[PDB]
Amino acid sequence: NDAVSGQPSIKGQPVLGKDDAPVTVVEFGDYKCPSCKVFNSDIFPKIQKDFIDKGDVKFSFVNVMFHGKGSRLAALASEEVWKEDPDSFWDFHEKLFEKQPDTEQEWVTPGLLGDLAKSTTKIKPETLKENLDKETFASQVEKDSDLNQKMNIQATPTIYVNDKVIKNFADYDEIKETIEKELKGK
């Protein structure tokens, strides 16, 4: 039916912000999802500046594989970057979304993900691509899928503010006021 209320576990997920931040915001997204591209450029930067920078919010991203083989390739790459060069993760993450074209045919290839690895991280292009080919990190993608299913994700992006499901990821008033209400409760 609808995404379930409740606090998703961010254990083993990419995180941004202070450890002790009182509010956790989780995005369930997909690198091929055009609404996720919009969230990344239009909404995410406001959450950073209003909340993450000041330590009120810690943010996490969980992979959702809604757009076929390219979603899975992208997710495998994303997982590897988090494990091997976490300090660089959010730079890689942002550039992969920035790379998403406004066209609908498959666009995610190992070569594309390699060049992102090269510009944004300390990881070697050929290492990543070998890992993509071997599906070295398939278990992390499966763990994300398990979590997606547990929360009953129906569409991407789905944003959680603590245990609250955001109804419209594009409504910054909703996101901001919800974060603020949670901060109060804290």
Cα shape: globular
Name of the CATH homologous superfamily: Glutaredoxin
Order of helices and strands: EEHEHHHHHEEH
Strand content: 5-15%
Largest sheet: 5 strands, mixed
Distance between the termini: 30 Å
The number of domains is 1
Rg over CA atoms, rounded to whole Å, is 16 Å
Remind me, CATH topology? Glutaredoxin
Number of helices: 7
Helical proportion?
Answer: 40-55%
CATH class: Alpha Beta
Q: How many beta-strand elements?
A: 5
Q: What topology, given as strand order, has the largest sheet?
A: 1-3-2-4-5
Structural class: alpha+beta
What would CATH call the architecture? Answer: 3-Layer(aba) Sandwich
Structural description of this entry:
It is classed as oxidoreductase. Keywords: BdbD, DsbA, Trx-like, oxidoreductase, Competence, Disulfide bond, Redox-active center. The assembly is monomeric. By secondary structure, this protein is α+β, with helices and mostly antiparallel strands. It has one domain (1-186): Glutaredoxin (3-Layer(aba) Sandwich), CATH 3.40.30.10. The chain has seven helices and five strands. It has helices at residues 34-52, 68-84, 89-99, 110-120, 125-134, 138-150, 172-185; strands at 15-16, 23-29, 57-63, 158-161, 164-165. Strands 1-3-2-4-5 form a five-stranded mixed β-sheet, with helices on both faces. Strand 4 (158-161) and strand 5 (164-165) form a beta hairpin. The longest helix is centred in the first third of the chain and has 19 residues, at 34-52. The protein is globular, with a radius of gyration of 16 Å. The two termini are 30 Å apart.
